[PDB]
């Protein structure tokens, strides 16, 4: 009745049975890079 030839293993990104798939995946949102910097400080008590 039906034949479904599908990829796997090293063919993960490949499907070979034409089902007419219109699937268009979205794009990964760019996350803001958050580098952490801890330089030394002179005392803010110098102000007082």
């Amino acid at each position: 009745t039906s034949i479904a030839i599908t990829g796997s293993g090293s063919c993960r990104h490949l499907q070979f049975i034409p089902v007419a798939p219109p699937g268009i995946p979205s794009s990964v949102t760019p996350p803001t890079e958050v580098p952490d910097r801890d330089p030394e400080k002179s005392s803010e008590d110098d102000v007082y």
Partner: protein, 159 residues
């Protein structure tokens, strides 16, 4: 006279979903009155001298002197069988052998996975090993292949 034995069958290597077929060597058994295996009746038996059932995953044809089968994962591991060699003199020589059935070595990471849905109940097809081997050899012939063992069915589901 009673037939005699020279060479044993060490073990039979089989894999789940794979069809194996073994022809007995011509020097497996000897008799002073026959001298050949092909001219002597050969049967396959269980521990208490019972034959293989029709539904068993391994069968063996005497006229073709050929054993064959296809195992399932519920029958992985060891099994034992006896070869009985009976001459025209009504005397039987016995050899024993062991069969190791392994899981499919490729397992889950196969680069290709063929899938198909058919019509009709899968209950008679699964329940019949004859239907299973006919299906396997029919796929092999559909590809034009000779060695039907190149097919490894992995899973059948009632739909």
């Amino acid at each position: 006279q009673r037939p005699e034995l020279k060479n044993h069958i060490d073990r039979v290597d089989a894999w789940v979903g794979t069809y194996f077929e073994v022809k007995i060597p011509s020097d497996t058994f000897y008799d002073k009155e026959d001298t050949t295996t092909d001219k002597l009746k050969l049967t396959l038996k269980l521990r208490e001298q019972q034959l293989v059932g029709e539904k068993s995953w391994v069968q063996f044809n005497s006229n073709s002197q050929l054993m064959y089968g296809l195992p399932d994962s519920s029958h992985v591991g060891k099994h034992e069988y006896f070869m009985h060699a009976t001459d025209k003199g009504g005397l039987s020589a016995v050899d024993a052998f062991e069969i190791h059935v392994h899981k499919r070595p490729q397992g889950d990471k196969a680069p290709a996975r063929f899938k198909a849905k058919f019509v009709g109940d899968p209950a008679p097809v699964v329940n019949d090993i004859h239907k299973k081997i006919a299906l396997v050899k029919k796929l092999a012939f559909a590809f034009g292949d000779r060695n039907c063992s190149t097919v490894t069915l992995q899973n059948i589901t009632r739909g």
